[PDB]
Amino acid sequence: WGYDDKNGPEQWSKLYPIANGNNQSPVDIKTSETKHDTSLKPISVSYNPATAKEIINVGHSFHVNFEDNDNRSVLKGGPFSDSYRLFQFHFHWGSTNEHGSEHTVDGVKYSAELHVAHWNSAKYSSLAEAASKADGLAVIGVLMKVGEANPKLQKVLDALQAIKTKGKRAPFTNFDPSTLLPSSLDFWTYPGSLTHPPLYESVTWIICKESISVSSEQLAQFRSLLSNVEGDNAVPMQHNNRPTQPLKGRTVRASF
Ligand code: AUC
Ligand SMILES: [Zn+2]
Which portions of the sequence form the region Disordered? Predict the structure, then answer.
């Protein structure tokens, strides 16, 4: 599996039949059809920077991992009744600076997208277990619009120099991912899935209404990592976004 012609999104079904499921992500959010739900509570994030652990190149992308052995960093509120433990944040981008998000809004594709993932620690024993359950994961997706440079990304960009090829990892500490969210946390939520294999339909999506910025040169930096192991010929991490999937009867609720 990858994002190329040969093993990209259009082929994934050949291997993960769930790819053609009824709860696949991302989806296009048609704002004229979302449903206002008055039961939705404000999302509340309480992250501890001491939980930041490492940054790693996984080939198709890079992940920032957190210690998830306790409830030091959690997500609460929104559609939830239990708290979700923060385990990772990562990005999605495309081959062009203009079109690279996963989710679309009124058929408009953004430049990139941030995913802040958490697992249901109230109901499950570990992410492994939680990852395939319907209520296992909660992911906040934040849409990024190409424009002004965002100084909040700097620590992440700097870290990149050290995880240039596949399989490299570097300590990454004292960092609060909440510094990356927009100022207002109004949102849309829908039942969905992982946006790449294994594609489990285990995610409760929290899409921020407000987007954050990023510049061309910042995106170019993501695009500069390599999918190859060190010493092999260079193959750039050109894009890692999946096309939107049919809603198939699902409802997108808005907290506003
Ligand atoms: N986005 C997001 Au995930 C785990 N496993
Ligand atoms: Zn993602």
Answer: 1-26, 236-256
> Annotation-wise, does 63 bind a ligand?
yes
User: Could you tell me which residues come within 8 angstroms of residue 61 by beta carbon, excluding any fewer than 6 positions away?
Assistant: 90, 91, 92, 237, 240
CB 60 within 8 A of CB 3: yes
Q: What residue owns the CA closest to ligand 1's atom 2?
A: 117
- If you measure from the C-alpha of residue 56 to the centroid of ligand 1, how many angstroms do you get, rounded to a whole number? 14
CA-CA-CA-CA torsion sign (25, 26, 28, 30):
positive
Can you give the residue range of the structural domain that contains 90?
A: 1-256
Q: Given phi > 0 = left and psi -120 to 50 = alpha, else beta, which region is 107?
A: left
CA distance 177 to 194: 20
CATH of the domain at 185: 3.10.200.10
Using the mean position of ligand 1's atoms as its centre, give its distance from the Cα of residue 18 in Å: 16
Contacts of 150 (CB under 8 A, 6+ apart): 212, 213, 214, 215, 218
Resolution as reported, in Å: 2.0
Contact 253, 188 (CB under 8 A): yes
How many domains does one find in the chain? 1
Which residue shows structure tokens 């927009």? 182
Helix (H, G, I), strand (E, B) or coil at 225: coil
Rounded-to-10 torsion of CA 117, 120, 121, 123: -170
β strands within the chain, DSSP E: 28-29, 35-36, 41-46, 52-57, 62-66, 74-78, 84-93, 104-105, 108-109, 112-120, 137-146, 169-171, 187-192, 203-208, 212-214, 253-254
